[PDB]
């Protein structure tokens, strides 16, 4: 009988629920369609309570509810169409319909899915534009990876999982060092850095970039020490010369082996040359050990690779899953 309750029910009636597309630990997704336009499809994510969390609403739920609304309006961020409470006191997010899966399943399906340099260029353009829109609105994603890049019906890629996002912290405001999946975490976060910036996201983008080129995770460590060792091995050992003050980070650790000099652009050409010299340049600029010298999303969108032939593939021509 509450006015807000009947308003929520009126908003819930706007969309007819259909088949259950997925069953996840975080939420359950159903197909749906607008009541005024049954041709307009939609995904209804009903967030299921997590019995493991005793502190009320889960942080990922709050973070999505906030930032998906803040960032809505960009073609490369998943659109939060609506939000409403169900009769069973649960949260429901009416979102864009993205039936073509994600980018991880395209990368992994090496037997059947074929893509080339122009396709990687188009996908990286989408991802970079999404991250640029994030940072332009002072939001860190902190969990960029292939399976969080959904693909729409027309082929446009949308950044999706915002359960770890956070607004840009003010000076002296400490942030968590435990964000971003291990394989995609920048060196400063592995070292426990508490005052970082947008560079942390760029690193993940680079790690996505690399993973698109070799179609396998670049640095797939099973422990934080394994991740640090892999970064020292394949990118370069951080030292006071290339990264002033790195040894003073809250959780700085070094395997205490012979230091490896930071590999230059040319060193990558042997493995990633599939994207061409210019392309590799971008890769290198995203994988700088010192986040201060790491390229920014705006600088990235202005890089020479995007205008270098061959031009990126039109989204209508991008590879689809089989």
């Amino acid at each position: 009988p509450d006015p807000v309750e009947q308003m929520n029910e009126a908003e819930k009636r706007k969309y007819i629920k259909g088949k259950k597309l997925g069953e996840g630990t975080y939420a359950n997704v159903y197909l749906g369609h607008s009541r005024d336009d049954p041709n307009f499809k939609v995904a209804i994510k009903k967030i299921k309570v997590q019995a493991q969390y005793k502190d009320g609403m889960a942080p990922d739920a709050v973070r999505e509810l906030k930032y998906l609304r803040e960032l809505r309006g960009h073609p490369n961020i998943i659109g939060l169409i609506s939000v409403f409470s169900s009769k069973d006191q649960n949260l429901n997010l009416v979102l864009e319909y993205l039936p073509l899966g994600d980018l991880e399943m395209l990368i992994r399906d090496v037997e059947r899915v074929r893509y080339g340099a122009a396709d990687i260029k188009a996908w990286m353009g989408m991802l970079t534009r999404a991250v640029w829109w994030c940072h332009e609105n002072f939001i860190l994603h902190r969990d960029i990876k292939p399976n969080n890049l959904l693909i729409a019906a027309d082929g446009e890629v949308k950044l999706a999982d915002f359960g770890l996002a956070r607004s840009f912290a003010d000076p002296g405001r400490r942030m968590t060092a435990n964000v971003i999946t291990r394989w995609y975490r920048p060196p400063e976060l592995l070292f426990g850095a508490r005052h970082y910036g947008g560079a942390v996201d760029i690193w993940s983008v680079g790690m996505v970039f690399a993973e698109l080129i070799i179609r396998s995770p670049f640095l797939p460590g099973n422990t934080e020490m394994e991740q640090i060792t892999l970064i020292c091995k394949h990118i370069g050992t951080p030292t006071e010369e290339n990264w002033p003050g790195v040894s003073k980070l809250p959780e700085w650790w070094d395997p205490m082996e012979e230091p490896i000099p930071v590999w230059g652009k040319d060193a990558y050409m042997a493995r990633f040359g599939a994207v061409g010299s210019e392309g590799v340049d971008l890769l290198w600029r995203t994988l700088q050990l010192d986040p201060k010298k790491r390229i920014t999303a705006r600088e990235m969108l202005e890089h020479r690779w995007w205008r270098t032939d061959p031009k990126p593939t039109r989204k209508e021509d991008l590879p689809k899953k089989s």
Binding site: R129, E136, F168, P171, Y196, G198, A199, G245, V246, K248
Partner: protein, 66 residues
């Protein structure tokens, strides 16, 4: 257009190099802030944007006109 027609260019303000605040001095020299990659430029830009965002947004008139 590299920004897909979404590029944000402020109209009534511009973020220049001379912008700074003395309270920032104590952090700019903090080892953790420099070595950890904290962007003071981003903070300055955010402050300016919030100081000028919606300066000509007249809530009463615009909302009664709808």
């Amino acid at each position: 257009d590299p920004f897909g027609g979404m590029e944000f260019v402020p109209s009534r303000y511009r973020v220049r190099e001379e912008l700074n605040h003395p309270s920032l001095d104590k952090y700019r020299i903090d080892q953790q802030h420099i070595t950890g990659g904290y962007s003071f430029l981003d903070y300055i830009s955010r402050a300016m944007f919030e100081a000028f965002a919606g300066l000509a947004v007249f809530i009463e008139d615009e909302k009664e006109a709808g």
